Amino acid sequence: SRPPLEYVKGVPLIKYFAEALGPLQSFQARPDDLLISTYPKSGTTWVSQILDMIYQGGDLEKCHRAPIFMRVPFLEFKAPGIPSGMETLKDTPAPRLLKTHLPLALLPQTLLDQKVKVVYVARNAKDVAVSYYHFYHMAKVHPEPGTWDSFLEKFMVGEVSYGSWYQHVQEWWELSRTHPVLYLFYEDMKENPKREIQKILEFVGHSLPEETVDFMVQHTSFKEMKKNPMTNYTTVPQEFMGHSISPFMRKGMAGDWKTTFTVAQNERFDADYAEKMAGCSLSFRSEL
Ligand SMILES: Nc1ncnc2c1ncn2[C@@H]1O[C@H](COP(=O)(O)O)[C@@H](OP(=O)(O)O)[C@H]1O
Ligand SMILES: O=[N+]([O-])c1ccc(O)cc1
Ligand SMILES: O=[N+]([O-])c1ccc(O)cc1
């Protein structure tokens, strides 16, 4: 019933995920692992499904084996009456696709040392905040969200599960200068998914015929993913995720934060964002 966050090295975390970090210290990466890394609500499930269809040669018979959360072990995950990501990892064959939201301050150092390829997805802060707010309501391991205005204040000082968005997107953007990281944007995927799939294909070093890429484009669109039981999280216990409170596949839009942010909230957020992202080669689009 909505436990408080726990701080581990400056990072606020779901308490079961904090507990999960102990067993995870004995995780050993493989030169052929591939890590999907995002701040929450930035496109994790979307890119996981794309990467997993690439892994199965574009066939969809093969992606229905089990849910996405079984096919792509979530490193730090754990919950009551649900297998930890470390547990699920035991039964995952190489080459493995792995998922995390851990800041670099917590990331198993084995992944950097083994030079593990990373697919990093970033999304504009305002859509992430709105998506995160609704997520808190359905995903019951999170503390109480509160009102949207108070949730928004928490999001700006990084007092939410996994801490600061502004730091996450910046530190992984720096990492990409020195480590194999394909650094993607949710808004790009939204604008031209085929182009982004072709980018992911080239990073993992596969080629596919164009028909298979079109097939993948269709089967990873918001509407297909919303109705697919394997990707929409409807198979987990109600005590864990309340689908009738807010579906995991909620809207899938770039730019709809405008229907949630008030004008005062926007002005404050914009002033704060400019202090935080002061210098940056890194930039985001709020809208298409
Ligand atoms: N194939 C797809 N196309 C566009 N957005 C999708 C997507 N699959 C899921 N998403 C969206 O991405 C979000 C969740 O990201 P994550 O998988 O990292 O938790 C949600 O955003 P919204 O709440 O804005 O709808 C969700 O609806
Ligand atoms: O990541 N998740 O939300 C999960 C992960 C694994 C599981 O068995 C159920 C849900
Ligand atoms: O709290 N949860 O159950 C979560 C949190 C993050 C995520 O990527 C999936 C599941």
Author numbering: 8 to 295
Paper text:
Finally, we determined the structure of the SULT1A1 D249G mutant that confers increased activity towards pNP and 3CyC, to highlight the importance of structural flexibility in tuning SULT1A1 transfer activity. To obtain deeper understanding of the structural differences between the D249G mutant and the WT protein, we determined the structure of the D249G mutant in complex with PAP and pNP (D249G-PAP-pNP). c The D249G mutation was generated on the background of the WT protein. We found that two mutations, namely D249G and Y240C, both located in the vicinity of the active site, can lead to substantial increases in catalytic activity with 3CyC and pNP at high substrate concentrations but lower affinity for these substrates. Structural analysis of the D249G mutant reveals an increase in the local flexibility of this region, resulting in a dramatic movement of His250 that can affect the SULT1A1 active site. The structural conservation of the His250 in many different SULT structures may highlight the importance of this region for controlling SULT catalytic activity. It is possible that the higher flexibility allows higher substrate turnover but reduces affinity due to changes in the active site. In accordance, electrostatic surface potential analysis of the D249G mutant relative to the WT enzyme indicates a dramatic change in charge distribution around the active site. These changes can lead to reduced affinity for the different acceptors due to possible differences in acceptor binding or effects on the dynamics and flexibility of SULT1A1.
The cytosolic sulfotransferase (SULTs) family catalyzes the transfer of a sulfate group from the universal 3′-phosphoadenosine 5′-phosphosulfate (PAPS) donor to a wide variety of acceptor molecules bearing a hydroxyl or an amine group. Sulfonation results in inactivation of the majority of acceptors, including neurotransmitters, steroid hormones and drugs, thus modulating their biological activity and rendering the product more soluble and readily excretable. Of these, the SULT1 family is the largest and is responsible for the sulfonation of phenol, thyroid and steroid hormones, as well as a variety of xenobiotics and known drugs. For example, SULT1A1 displays substrate preference for small phenolic compounds, while SULT1E1 shows a preference for estrogen acceptors.
